[PDB]
């Protein structure tokens, strides 16, 4: 194989790491609520606090989201970076993300689940890391703007 092929492989491996400001902007402007110019200027604290509000709304609708408030939506997860822990911690949080996605697959018609999984999109990069489970979970909604 060729050098550009092997480098496309290392780009696909390092897809989520922000190695300068321009890649961080292009990578953090990928939101599910806001457009790119607002989404690039938002913080982690802002999107976390309104995603925690939306998870409280989603949890009082369906009470199986409270353990996701315990682990995936806690305040240690504001500073938890995805691509800094090993493969075993990665598989732990990726089956956490799979649990959240196949729990909240049914709830996709009501905006608290959009504002709640906004934080999985922007903190844990599940649109590019945990992407097969995201497509498979929301496959039903294909005539809808959320898909």
């Amino acid at each position: 194989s060729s050098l550009s092929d092997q480098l496309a492989q290392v780009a696909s491996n390092n897809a989520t790491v922000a190695l300068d400001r321009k890649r961080r902007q292009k990578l953090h402007s990928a939101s599910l609520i806001y457009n790119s110019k607002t989404a690039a200027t938002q913080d982690y604290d802002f999107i976390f606090e309104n995603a925690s509000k939306a998870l409280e709304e989603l949890s009082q609708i369906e009470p199986k989201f409270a353990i996701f408030s315990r682990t995936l939506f806690s305040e240690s997860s504001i500073s938890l970076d995805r691509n800094v822990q090993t493969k075993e911690e990665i598989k732990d949080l990726d089956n956490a993300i799979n649990a959240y996605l196949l729990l909240a697959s049914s709830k996709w018609y009501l905006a608290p689940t959009l504002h709640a999984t906004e934080w999985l999109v922007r903190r844990f990069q599940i649109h590019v890391k945990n992407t097969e489970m995201l497509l498979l979970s929301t496959l039903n909604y294909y005539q809808t703007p959320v898909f």
Binding site: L3, S4, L7, N14, L19, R21, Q85
Partner: protein
Amino acid sequence: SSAAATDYLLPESNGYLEPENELEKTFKVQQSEIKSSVDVSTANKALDLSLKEFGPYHIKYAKNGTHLLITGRKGHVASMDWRKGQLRAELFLNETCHSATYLQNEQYFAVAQKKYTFIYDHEGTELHRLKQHIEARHLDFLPYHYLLVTAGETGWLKYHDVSTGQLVSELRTKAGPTMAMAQNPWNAVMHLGHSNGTVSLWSPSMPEPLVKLLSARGPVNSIAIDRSGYYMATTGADRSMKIWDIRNFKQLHSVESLPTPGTNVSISDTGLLALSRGPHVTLWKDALKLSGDSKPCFGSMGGNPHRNTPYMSHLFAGNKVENLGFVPFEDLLGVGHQTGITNLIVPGAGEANYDALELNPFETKKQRQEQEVRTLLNKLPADTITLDPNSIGSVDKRSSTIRLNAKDL
């Protein structure tokens, strides 16, 4: 005192690996075991390019570890961002290239071709063909002085100012072709190794070498200098690694009778010593120290704690490695060999806390532009290169040490 209190403010910690048992030796720890034990970002930094058809690949990293410059022996020179997947020059110069280096950036690089040294821009267009630098085999850039230094099969050492464009110095080595070449990062003098077993320390002011050391017998295969400018490891072709004090010119260690001649040495920013003897790469920790208990051994005869066994080793079983280079601010060792590039996760092997206004691994396009203009503005003249850097504020070593009050005149 206040400058030394900054070690609280230092963000990161250095890496390591520690045995935690007496059965668990450290040189028998495998690279797949490291890649399982460390995180996904570092495991993805440990790249491997299998480029089989062109020759053994001389490796080179930019001075922040952002860009990689490989040269095949046949013609294949590629400058790339090895940690994204972005290459920005892939040019096949069908004559035998030997070496390359970046100049002050990823934006220009100099390659040493069949005879002439060429200089290429960021995307690979040829900027310059140097009519001097007749047969280079070793290029190295002096970044604070903006000088491309060139040595090779001719017995000549040439310093070329990259900014003005002007050949600063031509010096007769007078000792045949230059077998090895390294730069002291401390004081920017060039240690060249000849076929006499002689290292000579050179400056572009004096047409004679500043110092001539008798390192080895036979020729001198490789030289590496610490970034503190204190120790120098030279491998000769007489199967002899030798650790040298640079400042006082004592010989610290003499590891004679290596099993096969060490073809490369390198010294990391945290003082590891990476020797390479063909298929084998072997790294020692704390080998550049004064005491005889820091002499690098290969085994500990009966479990002696006062024997510096290898910190880690690796075997490139197919091939013979071309050169070694540590990745600057990361825990990796990039070795270029016959079938391309391999990074090795060496945990003790990089400055965890860089300074971001000397040279920044996260630097942007605007920061590159302004830092280029600012370092160009504070470029040091080539005459200020002395054996010690602190000798350009002083008075003459003539001109009597007491100032004179005109009564005594």
